[PDB]
């Protein structure tokens, strides 16, 4: 029963969990913001230029977290804390 085997198993499980959670969050947030943008453009085409400014803000808040996940996720698998 090698310890590093358990280390890697736990790290990979945690990384998979973070990646799945980040994917869920990014997908839902992007979909919701896109729904808002599509409805806004449908009501008035002129607003298409304007709505990008707030819409692109929201994605930035959302994607950031997702891209943070990947980052922190990369920490667990590639350089697992506590690994010997």
């Amino acid at each position: 029963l090698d310890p590093n085997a358990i280390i890697t198993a736990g790290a990979l499980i945690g990384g998979g969990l973070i990646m799945g959670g980040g994917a869920i969050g990014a997908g839902i947030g992007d979909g919701i913001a896109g729904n808002a943008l599509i409805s806004g453009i449908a009501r008035q085409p002129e607003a298409q230029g304007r709505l990008f400014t707030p819409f692109f803000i929201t994605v930035g808040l959302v994607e950031a977290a997702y891209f943070i996940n990947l980052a922190f996720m990369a920490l667990f698998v590639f350089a697992t804390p506590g690994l010997q």
Binding site: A42, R43, Q44, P45, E46
Partner: protein, 42 residues
């Protein structure tokens, strides 16, 4: 009434607004007829 042949935001819904507007349209046309008849009488 016969029918003759950006997107507006109707609230609460187009149908309720139409139903409320039709009687007021008829009253407006009656009032216009009354005014024009009074002018003709004068």
């Amino acid at each position: 009434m016969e029918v003759e042949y950006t997107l507006y935001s109707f609230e609460p819904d187009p149908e309720t607004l139409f139903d409320a507007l039709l009687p007021r349209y008829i009253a407006t046309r009656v009032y216009a007829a009354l005014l024009e008849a009074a002018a003709s009488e004068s």
